[PDB]
């Protein structure tokens, strides 16, 4: 364990994929719920703009 010599460098020794192929370090047989923004969030952004307009 030695310092990075005062210069930061990013490297991934143990990555998920190596080029086209897939490394054996991590697993893929898992499914996660993905939650995106609904219409109410579109309304919220529009209301934010309307609030700024009212302030102006």
């Amino acid at each position: 364990m030695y310092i990075n010599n005062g210069r930061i460098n990013y490297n991934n020794e143990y990555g998920y994929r190596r080029g086209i192929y897939r490394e054996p370090f991590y697993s893929d047989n898992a499914d996660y719920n993905t939650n995106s923004k609904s219409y109410y969030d579109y309304l919220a952004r529009f209301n934010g703009f309307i609030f700024e307009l009212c302030d102006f």
Binding site: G6, R7, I8, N9
Partner: protein, 55 residues
């Protein structure tokens, strides 16, 4: 970011005045301390360009 760090180091080297600091200090005097004798410790203190906040 490494370029920025190298710029900082180069400008610290070129302008020596910016290296000055007045953070606190603790000089230990003894056979194996920072200074051999008490005269050396207070001779070095008078040589500091900027006196720290507490010694």
């Amino acid at each position: 970011v490494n370029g920025l760090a190298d710029d900082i180091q180069k400008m610290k080297d070129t302008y020596e005045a910016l290296t000055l600091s007045n953070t606190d200090v603790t000089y230990t005097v003894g056979q194996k301390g920072d200074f051999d004798t008490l005269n050396h410790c207070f001779e070095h203190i008078e040589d500091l360009i900027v006196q720290p906040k507490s010694i």
